[PDB]
Design a protein around this nucleic acid. Structure first.
Lengths: 112, 123, 251, 70, 94, 122
RNA sequence: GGGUCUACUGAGAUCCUCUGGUAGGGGGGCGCUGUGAUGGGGUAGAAGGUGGGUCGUGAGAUCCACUGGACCCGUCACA
RNA sequence: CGCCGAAGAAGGGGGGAGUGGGUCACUCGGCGUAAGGUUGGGUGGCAAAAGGGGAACAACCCAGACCUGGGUUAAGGCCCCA
RNA sequence: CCUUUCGUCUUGAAACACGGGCCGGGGAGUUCACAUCAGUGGCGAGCUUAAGGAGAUUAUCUCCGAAGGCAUAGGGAAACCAAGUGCCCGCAGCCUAGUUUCUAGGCGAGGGGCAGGGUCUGUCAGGGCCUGAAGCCACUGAUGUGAGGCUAGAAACCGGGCG
RNA sequence: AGCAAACUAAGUACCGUGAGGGAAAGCUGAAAAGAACCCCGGAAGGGGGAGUGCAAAGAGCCUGAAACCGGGUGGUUAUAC
RNA sequence: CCCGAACGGAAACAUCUUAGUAGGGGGAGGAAAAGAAAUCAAUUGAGAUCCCCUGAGUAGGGGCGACCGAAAGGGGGACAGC
RNA sequence: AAGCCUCCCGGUGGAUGGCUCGGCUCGGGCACCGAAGAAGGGCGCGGCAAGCAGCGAAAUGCUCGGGUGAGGCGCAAG
């Protein structure tokens, strides 16, 4: 219902890389079942400097082993602080389009 | 342009008045249409020759759907300011000067159109 | 990045505003707030609970026939029925009905920023159609503004940075609004006008401008959507002062 | 609406067509042209409470713009 | 409703009729706390009395061996606390 | 603090108690009047004369001869509309569209009311 | 209904296909009265009524002559 | 074998219902001789199914009406009504 | 040229059933609260402030106020006990070379199946329940329940008065 | 509709032996300027003519729909729905 | 402050509930009532009463049927005690 | 000859539309009268006076101060 939220959907489907399009229907899914992630899970299924895309929101429960950079559309202000002190990086979907490493990175997995 | 009239004249529209408007005056002056939600009613049963129940299939063609009868596009005006936002130009639309605008405002208002080459019906 | 303006109309400083002003203009939440607080001021209306009920009316029973229908009549005349004359309403409104639309404090707060930021985009301010000759919007006045009492000098300031047009645009009070409200107090309708937010209240200018149509003075630590988005079309022209901004930046 | 006499209808040939314009009770003159603004509204029947004027009653200066429509 | 809605009894209404035992009115209140949650006070010697927790539940798994004195706990927690290096003080008071 | 509902307000002017009727009589003086009197507006009294600014008979000067205190309008001589019979009836013109031209200094009780309005000395 | 483009958030192009209808469910649209606004506007030449053109499948919209003699709509959102 | 299927999806969960008086035709029963009776099995309408024929017609046959127009056909019919 | 009269009740019954002189005006699924869902948004291991106070151009507004409630562990009556991991198939996406055009193979979130664990009970198998880390709040909406409860419709009974 | 109540009196007229029940009904324009005056009738804010006034829908007074009925316009009938 | 109802609900109804309300009688004032613990609760604590929000449909009652239904504590208001 | 239908015109009714010194809700103020005769009724009272309202045989208002300041003699023009 956010004008931005709809607007990006217009652009996410535009990009051809198979990962982005999958985001839309997870996004277009009902709000009440919208994607969401708690931290403790991602730390348990990741390697060093992994890039993972979160189709939803990230919740701050759990501890982090190794700095990893994540890409999502929504964060918990506490959760981010857990991320930075762990040495990772945050990255919005909207800002993530302009990266050719985002185009041609390696070791990316998608969770929820 | 030549394909403007060649469906309305043969596809003669139907007044679509209320079911059983003819018998009782308490309907005729209502002069509109309703969907009969009955059981023993007729047109809901689609019996022959009873000004058949309205349905979506009798549309007008989308190329002219809602075109002005002169072929242009009908868009209204209410004051002097609305004129400047005329779309594209005088070539595809016609203007209906307000049904309620005053003449002491009309006299200047009307002059603004023909100087811009617009077409005015309610002159 | 915005310029700074004086009591005369010459640019003399330049700062980038606190990161609030860049926020997305999230229309939807604004209305869901602009409505929410507006619910508060609905003094609960309600029809009288005992309207028309002051009767002993009754049906004449059945088999009378002369009593055509089980309509209820009082010893000769019919009343009390929902469908007929004068009796109590079908479902009369009462003050017991809910009025307010509650919003969480946080939910209200984060929304409020949007309108504040809405005052930044020159696109949105004209989207509400406010007319203004200032090249830069919004506009910041050096904080000596707070020291004017005489009302007339206010005008030249709105003349200085060139805002007189929206002053006149409000001056086109749309005669008389249609409907009964003309006899229920709301006899007119007026286009909203420029908004001034000042750092502290009780300054001389707080009350000094309540004559110019469309304008209001409201303290920064107080102002919300009910002043920035009159009508849920946020982008209404606004004015601020340097000292006020710092009072904002603290969130 | 005609009863205000803020309009005047024109008699031409007294035939079955009539012309109407807005008269100006001001301007104080019989030869004043500006008290008369020509329109283009030919009317089939003479209205009930209408006020009638004869074509020859018009100032000669204004006959020019009118006789052509006759 | 034995008569016609008695079907609701056998599927959705078990125990809808009659009583089932008594209750103890003096069952001591227990402030049970999860070890998993404990990696915070609340975001070195640590005791749950100041946080009012009585029995140290098994919870998840700790990260650092600390000083733990509480009222009570479970057995599995105790060895886990000893495993990491922490210890369990089963003091009956603060 | 007084209300602003239209209904109540109209009640006062349709129910004006007697000792407040000057309210719907006071009209604007002329500059020459205030020049030697130092006062803008004042209630009308008989024996005076006035000038008019609005209406089909704008620009008249007459004499204050008739008045309607309870509802608030006056009349002046030399200005009538003949009835069917031929007798004159007084044209009724409201103070709202008039300017006074002169007053009567023969009362000593209307005079002090003039004085108390902070007009300068005499 | 399902498989491409533009737009401070609805508008276009193309392809396939589907086309009786109560109980019932669901999608979308016009009208009435008030509130906020509203590039906005309209008014002694409104409103309304009568009759009649024109638009729209319709729901209705909208217009012209007259009558009237003082206040009334468009858009969005809300009740 | 054949058909539907990732354009349009086996299983699982969830919101909201109305529906518990049927009738008739054909066909195989029972009861009763019987019945446009009742009571069973299967199919079909109808109910909620227009359009053509049977003279008119809920159920008999043909045949499932997005609309306009053209053409060919079905059940039936082809002396006149027509 | 073709054409049983409206609505409803009704297997059909509508046409020998009912209610239907005409016109105009009025006139019937609303309110609250709870429960539960959907949609929508804010925040998130929290959520949430009520009641309430202070300041304010004064019922709008801003700040304050967790009071509390729900979730955050379940079992059993209790005494009490009290977990959150380990295997496998496998979607989207990714990587690999061929892209021969790709279930070719890995990685595999989610998910599914076997597990395991906590608990009471059974003397073991078992048996019941819980456990694979996300809810709360707000608006609108719908339905159930209780309140007159879509609208209208009874003989009834009772209290107190008046004949 | 709004409490029954906005009006010349509203719990008033009234229905009831009684406790009681319980009505209907707003708008002349700004100024009555209320049609002087002349003809008909006896009269009627009645007719006609004149006049006031922006306008008279001028007392029954804002605007003025239908059911209705009358005059007229346009078609149209006694071998037939 | 005394006296004291049926209607319905339980799909019947008699216990129960509807309910100390409808209503009767007495008596005041502008507010009334009440007001200084033979109070609580429970590790030796608080400190009149009243109302507001919670506690809480919890406790507890009843053909265990519809249903009824606290207190303590906490949070607010003014907090006066002779 | 009836008419029939439609329409123009007129009257018969007054919905629509408009206007409102009325009520309705809210909040906030204020919040006992009575044997010195209550509240509640019944009567009278003006030049020509019926109802209301006001008034009490001292009956459309009596006295005294205070304000007010040129008309007043209510609803309601003779």
């Amino acid at each position: 219902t956010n004008i931005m939220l709809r607007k990006l959907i217009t652009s996410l489907k535009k990009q051809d890389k198979a990962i982005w399009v999958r985001v839309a229907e997870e996004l277009e899914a009902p709000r009440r079942k919208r994607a969401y992630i708690n931290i403790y899970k991602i730390n348990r299924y990741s390697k060093a400097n992994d890039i993972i895309v979160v189709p939803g929101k990230v919740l701050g429960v759990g501890n982090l082993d190794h700095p990893v950079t994540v890409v999502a559309l929504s964060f918990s202000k506490p959760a981010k602080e857990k991320i930075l002190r762990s040495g990772g990086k945050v990255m919005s979907l909207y800002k993530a389009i302009q990266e050719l490493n985002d185009f041609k990175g390696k070791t990316v997995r998608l969770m929820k | 342009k030549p394909a403007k009239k060649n469906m309305k004249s043969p596809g003669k529209a139907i007044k679509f008045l209320r079911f059983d408007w003819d018998k009782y005056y308490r309907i005729g002056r209502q002069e509109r249409w309703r969907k009969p939600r009955g059981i023993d009613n007729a047109i809901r049963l689609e019996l022959k020759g009873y000004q058949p129940k309205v349905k979506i299939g009798y549309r007008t063609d989308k190329q002219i759907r809602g075109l002005h009868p002169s072929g242009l596009r009908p868009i209204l005006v209410k004051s002097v300011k609305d004129l400047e936002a005329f779309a594209k130009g005088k070539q595809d639309v016609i203007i209906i000067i307000s049904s309620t605008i005053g003449l002491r405002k009309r006299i200047e208002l009307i002059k603004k159109a023909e100087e811009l080459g617009l077409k005015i019906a309610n002159r | 990045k915005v310029s700074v303006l004086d009591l005369k109309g010459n640019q003399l400083e330049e700062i980038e505003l606190p990161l609030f002003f860049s926020y997305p203009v999230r229309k939807d939440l604004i209305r869901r707030v602009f409505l929410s607080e507006f619910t508060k001021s609905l003094q609960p209306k309600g029809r009288d609970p005992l309207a028309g009920k002051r009767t002993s009316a009754l049906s004449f029973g059945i088999n009378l026939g002369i009593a055509r229908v089980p309509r209820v009549k009082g010893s000769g005349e019919a009343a009390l029925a929902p469908n007929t004359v004068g009796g109590r309403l079908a479902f009369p409104p009462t003050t017991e009905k809910r009025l307010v639309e509650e919003v969480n404090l946080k939910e209200k707060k984060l929304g409020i920023i949007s309108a504040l930021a809405a005052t930044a985009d020159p696109n949105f301010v004209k989207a509400r159609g406010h007319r203004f000759t200032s090249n830069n919007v919004p506009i910041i006045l050096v904080d000596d503004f707070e020291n004017i009492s005489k009302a007339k000098e206010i005008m030249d300031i709105l003349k200085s940075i060139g805002v007189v047009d929206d002053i006149k645009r409000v001056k086109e009070s749309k005669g008389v609004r249609a409907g009964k409200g003309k006899m229920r107090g709301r006899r007119y309708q007026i286009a909203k006008g420029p908004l001034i937010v000042v750092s502290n209240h009780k300054s001389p200018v707080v009350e000094s401008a309540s004559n110019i149509p469309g304008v209001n003075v409201v303290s920064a630590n107080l102002v919300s959507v009910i002043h920035l988005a009159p009508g849920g079309h946020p982008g209404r022209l606004t004015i601020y002062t340097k000292s006020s901004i710092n009072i904002l930046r603290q969130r | 609406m005609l009863k205000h006499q803020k309009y005047v209808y024109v008699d031409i040939g007294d035939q079955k067509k009539f012309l109407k314009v807005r008269f100006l009770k001001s301007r104080s003159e019989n030869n004043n042209p500006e008290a008369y603004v020509i329109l283009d509204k030919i009317s089939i029947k003479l209205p009930r409470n209408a006020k009638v004027i004869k074509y020859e009653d018009l100032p000669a200066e204004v006959k020019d713009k009118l006789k052509l429509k006759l | 409703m034995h008569k016609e809605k008695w079907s609701w009894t056998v599927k959705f209404g078990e125990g809808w009729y009659g009583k089932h035992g008594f209750r103890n009115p003096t069952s001591k209140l227990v402030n049970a706390i999860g070890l998993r949650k404990l990696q915070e006070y609340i975001d070195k010697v640590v005791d749950l009395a100041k946080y009012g927790y009585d029995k140290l539940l098994g919870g998840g798994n700790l990260r650092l061996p600390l000083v733990i004195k509480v009222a009570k706990a479970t057995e599995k927690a105790k060895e886990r606390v000893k495993e990491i290096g922490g210890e369990i003080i089963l003091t009956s008071s603060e | 603090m007084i209300s602003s509902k239209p209904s109540k307000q109209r009640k006062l002017v349709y129910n004006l108690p007697n000792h407040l009727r000057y309210k719907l009589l006071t009209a604007r003086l002329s500059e020459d009047l205030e020049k030697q009197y130092g006062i803008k507006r004042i209630s009308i009294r008989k024996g005076d004369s006035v000038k008019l600014m609005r209406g089909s008979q704008v620009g008249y000067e007459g004499k204050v001869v008739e008045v309607d205190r309870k509802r608030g309008r006056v009349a002046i001589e030399g200005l009538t509309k003949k009835k069917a019979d031929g007798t004159p009836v007084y044209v009724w013109v409201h103070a709202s569209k008039v300017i006074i031209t002169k007053l009567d200094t023969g009362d000593k009780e209307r005079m002090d009311a003039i004085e108390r309005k902070r007009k300068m000395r005499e």
